[PDB]
Amino acid sequence: GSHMATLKVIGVGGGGNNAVNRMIDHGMNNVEFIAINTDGQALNLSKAESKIQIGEKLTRGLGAGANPEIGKKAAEESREQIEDAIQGADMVFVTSGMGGGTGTGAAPVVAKIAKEMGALTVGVVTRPFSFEGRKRQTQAAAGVEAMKAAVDTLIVIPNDRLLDIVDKSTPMMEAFKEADNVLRQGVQGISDLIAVSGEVNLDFADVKTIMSNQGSALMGIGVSSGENRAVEAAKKAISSPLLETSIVGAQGVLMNITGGESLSLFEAQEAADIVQDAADEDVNMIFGTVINPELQDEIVVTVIATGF
Numbered sequence: 666g667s668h669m670a671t672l673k674v675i676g677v678g679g680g681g682n683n684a685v686n687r688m689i690d691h692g693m694n695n696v697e698f699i700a701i702n703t704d705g706q707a708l709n710l711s712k713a714e715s716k717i718q719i720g721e722k723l724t725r726g727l728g729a730g731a732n733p734e735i736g737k738k739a740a741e742e743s744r745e746q747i748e749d750a751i752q753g754a755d756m757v758f759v760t761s762g763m764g765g766g767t768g769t770g771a772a773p774v775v776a777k778i779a780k781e782m783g784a785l786t787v788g789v790v791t792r793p794f795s796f797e798g799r800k801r802q803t804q805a806a807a808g809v810e811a812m813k814a815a816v817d818t819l820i821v822i823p824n825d826r827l828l829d830i831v832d833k834s835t836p837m838m839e840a841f842k843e844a845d846n847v848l849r850q851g852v853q854g855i856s857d858l859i860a861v862s863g864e865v866n867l868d869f870a871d872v873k874t875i876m877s878n879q880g881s882a883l884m885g886i887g888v889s890s891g892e893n894r895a896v897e898a899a900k901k902a903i904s905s906p907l908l909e910t911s912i913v914g915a916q917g918v919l920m921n922i923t924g925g926e927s928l929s930l931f932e933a934q935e936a937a938d939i940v941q942d943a944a945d946e947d948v949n950m951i952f953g954t955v956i957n958p959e960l961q962d963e964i965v966v967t968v969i970a971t972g973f
């Protein structure tokens with residue numbers, strides 16, 4: 666009697682739906698996508714299999730005009746349609762940009778419904794750029810607080826961090842793809858975790874233990890080869906140029922290491938030690954290992970960190 670967890674990614678509002686579209690385009694098998702929006706013009710362009718227009722009575726098919734109360738009411742009045750789209754999910758990722766009306770107000774409602782539908786619920790949300798002004802920032806902050814109350818775990822990406830990773834000419838869309846990778850690689854790492862029986866096996870119950878009712882989280886992946894591969898991959902997995910919540914202070918970690926037949930005991934300890942030393946806490950680890958003999962010299966380290 667084997668379990669295969671159902672993973673769903675739900676985009677709420679404009680930025681959430683664009684993250685969903687870009688993830689579908691990148692190719693994401695075994696994951697189901699849901700697009701929720703007030704804005705019918707955008708929703709018509711969604712690539713998601715399941716689309717939910719919310720608030721048509723309130724907005725006549727427009728967005729929420731920067732009013733989070735409208736996003737909140739829209740979501741509440743579509744509760745049954747949202748439940749029906751979620752039903753059967755074991756894990757739901759809710760992604761949205763905070764600061765506008767639809768994401769700010771509707772994403773916390775979506776997350777609350779998912780947790781009520783029984784799903785392990787993870788939010789991955791942005792804060793606005795400082796150039797969008799103090800009022801947008803204050804509205805987003807209220808959204809982040811409401812998300813935190815509604816989810817099991819929350820990953821916040823301040824959009825100002827994108828300014829740290831661009832040069833003067835990096836296209837805006839390229840920058841946005843960098844933020845999208847936080848969610849996409851997190852989801853893919855859980856998917857890969859569930860699909861394979863590891864030599865030291867982790868499964869969805871381990872994901873639930875590390876993520877349920879925890880608050881802030883980090884989810885990261887690193888890949889390296891050659892000398893010092895395990896240390897390099899571990900450092901990449903915990904590196905957080907875009908993240909509000911770094912690895913520092915983590916008290917619980919799920920770490921999975923995947924390598925080929927050459928994967929050494931010593932280098933697995935080295936990777937585990939990198940993570941614990943960066944947390945600078947006594948970390949409760951849940952450690953796994955997968956041998957994929959297709960891999961020659963590459964090692965992959967996946968981390969989920971909570972307990973902040």
Ligand SMILES: Nc1nc2c(ncn2[C@@H]2O[C@H](COP(=O)(O)OP(=O)(O)O)[C@@H](O)[C@H]2O)c(=O)[nH]1
Nearest residue numbers: 678679680683762764765766767768793794841
């Ligand atoms: N990183 C990122 N930020 C986005 C993107 N789209 C919108 N944003 C941010 O999300 C906030 C809300 O925008 P949007 O989602 O369109 O608002 P809503 O649909 O009215 O809720 C904006 O103020 C931006 O900071 C996106 O594709 N990527």
Ligand SMILES: [Ca+2]
Nearest residue numbers: 858861862867
């Ligand atoms: Ca497994």
